[PDB]
Ligand binder design. Sequence first.
Ligand SMILES: [Cl-]
Ligand SMILES: [Cl-]
Ligand SMILES: [Cl-]
Ligand SMILES: [Cl-]
Ligand SMILES: [Cl-]
Ligand SMILES: [Cl-]
Ligand SMILES: [Cl-]
Ligand SMILES: [Mg+2]
Ligand SMILES: [Mg+2]
Ligand SMILES: [Mg+2]
Ligand SMILES: [Mg+2]
Ligand SMILES: [Mg+2]
Ligand SMILES: [Mg+2]
Ligand SMILES: [Mg+2]
Ligand SMILES: [Mg+2]
Ligand SMILES: [Mg+2]
Ligand SMILES: [Mg+2]
Ligand SMILES: [Mg+2]
Ligand code: NA
Ligand code: NA
Ligand code: NA
Ligand code: NA
Ligand code: NA
Ligand code: NA
Ligand code: NA
Ligand code: NA
Ligand code: NA
Ligand code: NA
Ligand code: NA
Ligand code: NA
Ligand SMILES: [Sr+2]
Ligand SMILES: [Sr+2]
Ligand SMILES: [Sr+2]
Ligand SMILES: [Sr+2]
Ligand SMILES: [Sr+2]
Ligand SMILES: [Sr+2]
Ligand SMILES: [Sr+2]
Ligand SMILES: [Sr+2]
Ligand SMILES: [Sr+2]
Lengths: 49, 142, 142, 150
Amino acid sequence: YAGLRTPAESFGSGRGQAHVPKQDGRARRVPQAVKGRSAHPPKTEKDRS
Amino acid sequence: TELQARGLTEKTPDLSDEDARLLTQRHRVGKPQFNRQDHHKKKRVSTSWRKPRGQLSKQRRGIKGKGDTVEAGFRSPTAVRGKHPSGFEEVRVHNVDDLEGVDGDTEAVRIASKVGARKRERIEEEAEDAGIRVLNPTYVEV
Amino acid sequence: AEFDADVIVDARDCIMGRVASQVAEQALDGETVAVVNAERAVITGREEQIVEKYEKRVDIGNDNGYFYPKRPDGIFKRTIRGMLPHKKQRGREAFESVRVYLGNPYDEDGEVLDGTSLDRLSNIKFVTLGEISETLGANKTW
Amino acid sequence: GISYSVEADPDTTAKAMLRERQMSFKHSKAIAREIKGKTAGEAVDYLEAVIEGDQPVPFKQHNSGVGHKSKVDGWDAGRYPEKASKAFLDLLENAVGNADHQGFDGEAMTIKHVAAHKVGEQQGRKPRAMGRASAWNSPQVDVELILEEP
RNA sequence: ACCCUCAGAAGGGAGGCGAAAUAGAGCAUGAAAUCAGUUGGCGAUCGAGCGACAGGGCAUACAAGGUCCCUUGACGAAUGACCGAGACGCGAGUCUCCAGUAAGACUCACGGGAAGCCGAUGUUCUGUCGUACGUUUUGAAAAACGAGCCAGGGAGUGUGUC
RNA sequence: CGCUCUAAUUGGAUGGAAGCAGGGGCGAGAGCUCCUGUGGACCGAUUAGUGACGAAAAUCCUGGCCAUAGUAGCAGCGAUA
Ligand SMILES: [Cl-]
Ligand SMILES: [Cl-]
Ligand SMILES: [Cl-]
Ligand SMILES: [Cl-]
Ligand SMILES: [Cl-]
Ligand SMILES: [Cl-]
Ligand SMILES: [Cl-]
Ligand SMILES: [Mg+2]
Ligand SMILES: [Mg+2]
Ligand SMILES: [Mg+2]
Ligand SMILES: [Mg+2]
Ligand SMILES: [Mg+2]
Ligand SMILES: [Mg+2]
Ligand SMILES: [Mg+2]
Ligand SMILES: [Mg+2]
Ligand SMILES: [Mg+2]
Ligand SMILES: [Mg+2]
Ligand SMILES: [Mg+2]
Ligand code: NA
Ligand code: NA
Ligand code: NA
Ligand code: NA
Ligand code: NA
Ligand code: NA
Ligand code: NA
Ligand code: NA
Ligand code: NA
Ligand code: NA
Ligand code: NA
Ligand code: NA
Ligand SMILES: [Sr+2]
Ligand SMILES: [Sr+2]
Ligand SMILES: [Sr+2]
Ligand SMILES: [Sr+2]
Ligand SMILES: [Sr+2]
Ligand SMILES: [Sr+2]
Ligand SMILES: [Sr+2]
Ligand SMILES: [Sr+2]
Ligand SMILES: [Sr+2]
C-alpha cells in the first residue's frame, strides 16, 4: 500500500492543470508523482526458487 | 631544470605497408560528429547519439543538412580499427604482471588512472626495459 | 567626387538591360564600372506601355515603402542592382563599385560594349530613359 | 556568501565587503559598474552627488521605462538610488579604513575591483484577490571591493 | 584570543586554530538552470530551426593527439587534351593523326619548410543543403496538440494455467 | 552498450578511490579510456547471475531558477490632512 495511503483525487480539466491526483496541492499516488506508488516493484508473491 | 617524460616517448610501432596505408586512410577520411539530432537546440538534450525515431524527423528521413545517421558504412577498416593514432595497439595496464606478454614493437601500454604514483614508477621503469612505450608517462624534472 | 573606374561605359543608344547584364557580370569580376550618359540610354517597346510599367512602380508602396527611382541616374542603377545579389557581402561590394552618371563627367569617352548598341535607323519603337524620367515627373537636371 | 573572485597582492591592495544587504541588486550592478576604476575618494564624492541628486547613475541594463537623464553621458536612462549608493559608502568607508590601518593612502587608491552579487532573497508573501497570495521578496546582496595603490 | 573599522555581541579588515576555514554552523562532495565580474570570437547597413559537411580569420602554457605545407620524382583508375598537320561543313563547329599520349584522385620517396605549426577546441566569415522535436494525421513549419529553463523523479510487473 | 546488487576468478586506492570541472585518444554507435584541477574515501575487470536498469516529451511529478521588471500595486470609498 505504499503511496496508496491517500484520498488524493484529480481536479480534471479546468485549471490549466494536468489531470494528476492531488491532495492539499501536493500531487499523489500515481507512479509518475514523487511520493507516489511504485509501478512495478519487487513482489513477495514471487517464487525466487 | 626541466621536465622530461619517463619511458620511450618517441617509439613508433612497425606496420605492414597495408596497415600503414589503412591507418593513414582512416586519419584522412575521418567521420561525422554523430551527435543526437538537435542536441544543440535544447540544453536538456545531450550530445550522446540516439536514433532519430520521429516519424517526420528530417534527419531520420535523411534530409541533407540534418546530419548523417549512424550506419555500418561508416565503420573504420578492420585492419586498423581501434589503434592509437600513433599506429600502436593500446594495452590496458594496472600493475607490472600486466606488462608481461606485451610486445613493444606493436603495442604501446596505457597505465590505468587509479594506479598510484608509487606503482606507476615500477611499471614505468619496468615497461621501459621491455621496450614498451607508455602512452601516459610521468614527467619528472631532470 | 572622383571614381577610379577600371571601365567607363557609354550607354548612349544602348539597350539598357543588355548593358546592365554585362556591367553586372563585370563588377562581379572585381571590375570598377561607371556607366555614362545614363539619360541617353534606350529601352525597346511601345513607349506608352513601357512608361505605364514604370509609372506603376512609382505608385506602388506602403509604410514599409517601395522607394523607386525616377531619374535616368539610378533607374539605371536600380536595373543593375536587380542583376546583383546586393544583399550578400560579395554582391553589395560589386554593386557599390559601380556608378551611373548623367552625361559624362570624365575626360575619356566610355566604350560601347558589344551587342548593347541600338541602331536608330532600323528601329522606331524605343524610348530614352530621359524621356521616361521626364514623364515620371523627375526634374530634367540633365 | 561570496569570496573575492579576484587576486589581490596584500602588499599593494586593501579589501572590503558588504554582506546579505537588503537593497536592489539591480541598482548595485549599476553603481558598482559606474564607480569601478575611480579613486576611492572620487567614488565617495560621486555617490554623495547621487544621494544628493546632482549626479545620476546610468541604468544601462535594468532600464525599462526609466526616464532619460540629461546628465547621463553616452547613454539615456539613469536614476539616483540613494539606498544602494549609501550602502556602498559604508563599504568605501570600511575599505579606506582598513586601507589606512595598513599604511596606504585609502582615498588616493584606485577601485581595482568591485562587483555586486545576488546572495539570495529574503522571502515574503502578499495576499491577493480570489484567496491567493504571491511572492513579495527582498533581494539579499553581497558586494566585494578591492583598492590598489595607483 | 587580541587589534582596527562601525550606531554596532552585526558586518568588514587583519589575525589565531587545523592537513584542510574554498571544513566557520542545513559547516563532506558541490552538477545543471542561472547571476556578478572578466577573457576569447562577433558587433550599432543588416535577416530568422540556431545547424550538418567544406573551406577561410582570429584565439590556444603543460599534460593526455603529432602531424601539416611547398619543388621535384615514383605509381597513375574512370576520364582525357592544347598545339601542329590533313581533310569536311553555309555556318556555329566536326573528323583523322599527334594519343588513351600530356594530364589524372590516393599513396610513397628525395630535398626544403611550418610549432598556434597540423589535429583539436572556442568563435566568426563564405559555399552548398536546411520552415525544430515528439504526437495526431491521407497530408505538420503549420493559423492542429505538448513544453518557460535545468536537475532529480517517471511506464511490459507477479501468480496460476495454456 | 550502460546501470544495481550477489557469486566465483582476479585487480586498483592516502605515493590519493568515486564524484565533479576543463581538456586529449578510441569506437559507425550505445559508449570506453587517459590528462589536469578539485575531491578525500573508496573503485574495478572477467565470468555466471540479479533487476524498483536507461527519458526530451505525458496541460507528466517535486525542487531549484531566468525573462517578465525595478514593471503593476502602495490613488479612486462623502473619512482628500
Ligand atoms: Cl559492425
Ligand atoms: Cl512607398
Ligand atoms: Cl541579394
Ligand atoms: Cl522599330
Ligand atoms: Cl533582482
Ligand atoms: Cl591509399
Ligand atoms: Cl515490451
Ligand atoms: Mg514513495
Ligand atoms: Mg544541449
Ligand atoms: Mg516609466
Ligand atoms: Mg477571502
Ligand atoms: Mg557545503
Ligand atoms: Mg485533419
Ligand atoms: Mg575471470
Ligand atoms: Mg534517470
Ligand atoms: Mg521520450
Ligand atoms: Mg513593459
Ligand atoms: Mg479637507
Ligand atoms: Na494517509
Ligand atoms: Na514466493
Ligand atoms: Na522593356
Ligand atoms: Na514608390
Ligand atoms: Na536596453
Ligand atoms: Na549628456
Ligand atoms: Na545624454
Ligand atoms: Na574554425
Ligand atoms: Na498529440
Ligand atoms: Na511535428
Ligand atoms: Na497552417
Ligand atoms: Na503547465
Ligand atoms: Sr587519477
Ligand atoms: Sr557573361
Ligand atoms: Sr534592458
Ligand atoms: Sr582570515
Ligand atoms: Sr597511364
Ligand atoms: Sr524505472
Ligand atoms: Sr524573479
Ligand atoms: Sr493618500
Ligand atoms: Sr475603487
